[PDB]
Amino acid sequence: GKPEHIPDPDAKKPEDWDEEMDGEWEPPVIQNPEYKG
């Protein structure tokens, strides 16, 4: 149905990120409001 946790689309690449240092940014997640499995 859904996973244990759900991703964050509302987060963004930090305004102070270093793409040339870390490369790929990845968002946080959210506790799933309806984790069933």
Swiss-Prot record:
Compositionally biased intervals (Acidic residues): 16-25
Q: Specify where the region named Interaction with PPIB lies, as residue ranges.
A: 2-34
**What stretches of residues are sequence repeats?**
8-19, 23-33
The entry's note on the tissues where this protein occurs is: Predentin and odontoblast.
Subcellular localization, per the record? Endoplasmic reticulum lumen; Cytoplasm, Cytosol; Secreted, Extracellular space, Extracellular matrix; Cell surface
| Family membership noted in the UniProt record | Belongs to the calreticulin family.
Q: How does it assemble?
A: Monomer. Component of an EIF2 complex at least composed of CELF1/CUGBP1, CALR, CALR3, EIF2S1, EIF2S2, HSP90B1 and HSPA5. Interacts with GABARAP, NR3C1 and TRIM21. Interacts with PPIB and SPACA9. Interacts (via P-domain) with PDIA5. Interacts with PDIA3/ERp57. Interacts with CLCC1.
Domain notes from UniProt: Can be divided into a N-terminal globular domain, a proline-rich P-domain forming an elongated arm-like structure and a C-terminal acidic domain. The P-domain binds one molecule of calcium with high affinity, whereas the acidic C-domain binds multiple calcium ions with low affinity.
Function statement: Calcium-binding chaperone that promotes folding, oligomeric assembly and quality control in the endoplasmic reticulum (ER) via the calreticulin/calnexin cycle. This lectin interacts transiently with almost all of the monoglucosylated glycoproteins that are synthesized in the ER. Interacts with the DNA-binding domain of NR3C1 and mediates its nuclear export. Involved in maternal gene expression regulation. May participate in oocyte maturation via the regulation of calcium homeostasis.
Q: What is this protein called?
A: Calreticulin
Species whose genome carries this gene: Rattus norvegicus (Rat)
Its gene name is: Calr
